[PDB]
Amino acid sequence: GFGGNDNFG
Amino acid sequence: GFGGNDNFG
Amino acid sequence: GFGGNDNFG
Amino acid sequence: GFGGNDNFG
Amino acid sequence: GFGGNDNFG
Amino acid sequence: GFGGNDNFG
Amino acid sequence: GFGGNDNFG
Amino acid sequence: GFGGNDNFG
Amino acid sequence: GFGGNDNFG
Amino acid sequence: GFGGNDNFG
Amino acid sequence: GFGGNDNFG
Amino acid sequence: GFGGNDNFG
Amino acid sequence: GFGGNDNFG
Amino acid sequence: GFGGNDNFG
Amino acid sequence: GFGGNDNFG
Amino acid sequence: GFGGNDNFG
Amino acid sequence: GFGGNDNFG
Amino acid sequence: GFGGNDNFG
Amino acid sequence: GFGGNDNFG
Amino acid sequence: GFGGNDNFG
Amino acid sequence: GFGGNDNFG
Amino acid sequence: GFGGNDNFG
Amino acid sequence: GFGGNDNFG
Amino acid sequence: GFGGNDNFG
Amino acid sequence: GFGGNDNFG
Amino acid sequence: GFGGNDNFG
Amino acid sequence: GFGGNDNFG
Amino acid sequence: GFGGNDNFG
Numbered sequence: 740g741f742g743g744n745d746n747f748g
Numbered sequence: 749g750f751g752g753n754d755n756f757g
Numbered sequence: 758g759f760g761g762n763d764n765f766g
Numbered sequence: 767g768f769g770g771n772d773n774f775g
Numbered sequence: 776g777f778g779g780n781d782n783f784g
Numbered sequence: 785g786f787g788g789n790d791n792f793g
Numbered sequence: 794g795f796g797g798n799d800n801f802g
Numbered sequence: 803g804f805g806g807n808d809n810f811g
Numbered sequence: 812g813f814g815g816n817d818n819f820g
Numbered sequence: 821g822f823g824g825n826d827n828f829g
Numbered sequence: 830g831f832g833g834n835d836n837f838g
Numbered sequence: 839g840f841g842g843n844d845n846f847g
Numbered sequence: 848g849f850g851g852n853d854n855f856g
Numbered sequence: 857g858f859g860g861n862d863n864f865g
Numbered sequence: 866g867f868g869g870n871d872n873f874g
Numbered sequence: 875g876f877g878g879n880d881n882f883g
Numbered sequence: 884g885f886g887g888n889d890n891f892g
Numbered sequence: 893g894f895g896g897n898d899n900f901g
Numbered sequence: 902g903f904g905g906n907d908n909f910g
Numbered sequence: 911g912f913g914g915n916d917n918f919g
Numbered sequence: 920g921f922g923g924n925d926n927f928g
Numbered sequence: 929g930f931g932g933n934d935n936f937g
Numbered sequence: 938g939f940g941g942n943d944n945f946g
Numbered sequence: 947g948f949g950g951n952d953n954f955g
Numbered sequence: 956g957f958g959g960n961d962n963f964g
Numbered sequence: 965g966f967g968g969n970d971n972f973g
Numbered sequence: 974g975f976g977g978n979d980n981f982g
Numbered sequence: 983g984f985g986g987n988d989n990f991g
Binding site: 954 | 983984
């Protein structure tokens with residue numbers, strides 16, 4: 740959805 | 749306005 | 758986006 | 767470690 | 776400083 | 785920030 | 794006019 | 803001196 | 812097993 | 821995983 | 830072991 | 839971290 | 848097996 | 857002295 | 866560290 | 875026989 | 884993690 | 893020892 | 902099998 | 911043994 | 920008949 | 929999986 | 938079989 | 947007269 | 956593994 | 965005549 | 974195979 | 983057949 744730092748899904 | 753039907757999915 | 762039968766042992 | 771999704775028969 | 780429409784530093 | 789490494793985006 | 798991370802003035 | 807009678811948005 | 816950070820054995 | 825006879829991981 | 834269809838020893 | 843930046847020591 | 852003799856059919 | 861992450865003085 | 870004469874504002 | 879530490883598996 | 888004389892992982 | 897068929901020790 | 906018999910002095 | 915290998919010790 | 924180890928007949 | 933109609937006797 | 942001072946088949 | 951293993955007689 | 960006697964001072 | 969001390973271990 | 978009026982004696 | 987007139991040791 741949102742990886743401000745990171746996103747796994 | 750960024751972007752609106754940006755379905756991260 | 759892992760969408761499967763995922764073990765993660 | 768074996769494991770996994772192993773379908774059989 | 777994450778800007779959507781704009782940002783300054 | 786100062787003496788820090790960062791992303792802010 | 795010190796700002797560690799931003800100074801507008 | 804950020805000096806301004808400006809609009810925005 | 813899942814080591815995440817480290818797996819000793 | 822000492823398998824006296826067989827191991828399989 | 831009898832492995833009639835298959836046998837893991 | 840797993841999905842996090844780190845400086846340790 | 849371990850320490851003994853065996854026949855596999 | 858020992859500052860770990862940061863020693864300012 | 867820093868010491869002696871200084872203002873920081 | 876053995877007589878040492880002998881971690882088996 | 885900043886092992887002193889020795890560190891692992 | 894005397895082991896008719898095997899001796900480990 | 903990280904580690905069976907070793908001295909950490 | 912009749913029909914089998916057999917050790918005599 | 921099938922004799923895993925022996926069959927006389 | 930197995931053969932049938934194997935008359936054994 | 939096995940015999941110490943003597944044996945016969 | 948008959949011995950599977952030994953006939954002394 | 957470590958030695959000291961230093962003046963971070 | 966297995967006459968002996970036979971330390972066997 | 975030993976099938977015909979065998980006298981074993 | 984076996985001559986049985988014998989002394990064993």
